[PDB]
Design an enzyme around this catalytic site. Structure first.
Site, PDB file in Angstrom:
ATOM      1  N   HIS A 192      42.654  51.568  35.786  1.00 38.52           N
ATOM      2  CA  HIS A 192      41.279  51.205  36.093  1.00 38.52           C
ATOM      3  C   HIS A 192      40.788  49.827  35.654  1.00 38.52           C
ATOM      4  CE1 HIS A 192      37.194  52.032  37.304  1.00 38.52           C
ATOM      5  NE2 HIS A 192      37.505  53.275  37.627  1.00 38.52           N
ATOM      6  N   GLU A 229      42.356  50.201  41.946  1.00 39.70           N
ATOM      7  CA  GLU A 229      43.088  51.371  41.475  1.00 39.70           C
ATOM      8  C   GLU A 229      44.099  51.974  42.440  1.00 39.70           C
ATOM      9  OE1 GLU A 229      38.456  52.536  40.487  1.00 39.70           O
ATOM     10  OE2 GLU A 229      39.957  54.092  40.172  1.00 39.70           O
TER      11      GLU A 229
END
Length: 325
Positions: free
Chosen positions: A162, A289
């Site tokens: 992330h 991501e």
């Protein structure tokens, strides 16, 4: 207590990791003017990271993104977790991998590996798993993230990284250019939870096949980029899938991954005191991501993300840093 771990190559590429959440804390790379720029958001202190709630740079699991309505069916058995984001279960819950202290199993000048175990008692998700994540930098100016795992009991495992990216320090990434080999995207509802539908990107604001600036995404009544969807990678059968760059700093980022999709989040709901005491605001960075389709555990037509005894979860993400010349 723990501590930041640094790795680097011989050409000016440095990465700083944190055992907590197997997080990518920093990533410095010289710009076109030869000036070092930290390409990812973060915090100057370790505690600030342990208190973060935006999953900045964390290794997310056991199931990245949302589990629709915090409920799923696995092997004929229903699993229900306590909602932690709206009515859904996001990023593995409050005790997901991103919120746990990983063990350092290997550390060298240009690489570091973290390991951690998780079972139903830890996060309410089915089965267990021993997860190992490695960050490595090489002479090709690449940051390689490897995701590996095994289990003793059958369950689900769909990870991602992330890190929020910003290549020039601008207040926002509206001017950044983005190009992706994605013909389709995963449809989401008001709560940004997948509906199970796949939509063509053609004629939509998510078509980045021609490379454009992020600021170009429809016209809302808030003038904010609400990007936060799964972009399905067009993969051949008979290569770079994403290119992110800034004409300003001249820094470019290209990505290739084994994962089938790349979730892009325009950082619309960000608002925290980051590095340099800076105040991150809406659309400050771009969360990239690489992962399996969001809500896969809820839709059987999406990829099967089960991890069973004897098998090996093995995925990788290769980030190549260069300059737009």
């Amino acid at each position: 207590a723990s501590g930041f771990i640094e790795i680097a190559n011989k050409q000016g590429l440095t990465a700083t990791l944190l055992p907590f959440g197997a997080t990518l804390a920093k990533l410095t790379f010289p710009d076109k003017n030869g000036k070092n720029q930290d390409l990812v958001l973060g915090f100057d202190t370790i505690d600030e990271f342990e208190k973060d709630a935006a999953s900045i740079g964390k290794t997310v699991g056991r199931v990245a993104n949302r589990i629709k309505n915090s409920t799923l069916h696995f092997d004929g058995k229903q699993y229900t977790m306590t909602p932690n984001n709206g009515p859904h279960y996001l990023h593995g819950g409050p005790n997901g991998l991103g919120y746990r202290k990983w063990e350092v199993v290997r550390h060298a000048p240009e690489s570091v590996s973290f390991s951690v175990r998780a079972n139903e008692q830890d996060d309410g998700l089915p089965g267990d798993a021993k997860i190992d994540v490695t960050y490595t930098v090489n002479d090709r100016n690449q940051l390689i993230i490897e995701h590996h795992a095994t289990c003793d009991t059958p369950g689900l495992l769909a990870l991602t990284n992330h890190a929020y990216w910003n290549l020039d320090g601008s207040d926002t990434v509206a001017e950044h250019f983005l190009e992706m080999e994605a013909d389709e995207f995963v449809e989401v509802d008001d709560t940004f939870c997948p509906t199970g539908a796949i939509r063509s990107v053609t004629d939509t604001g998510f078509d980045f096949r021609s490379g454009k600036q992020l600021k170009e995404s429809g016209k809302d009544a808030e003038e904010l980029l609400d990007l936060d969807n799964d972009l399905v990678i067009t993969k051949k059968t008979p290569s770079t899938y994403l290119r992110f760059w800034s004409e300003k700093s001249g820094i470019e980022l290209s990505i290739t991954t084994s994962y089938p999709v790349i979730h892009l989040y325009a950082s619309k709901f960000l608002d925290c005191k980051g590095k340099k005491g800076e105040h991150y605001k809406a659309n400050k960075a771009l969360a990239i991501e690489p992962q399996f389709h969001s809500a896969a555990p809820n839709f059987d037509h999406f990829p099967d993300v089960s991890l069973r005894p004897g098998d090996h979860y093995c995925q990788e993400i290769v980030y190549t840093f260069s300059h737009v010349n």
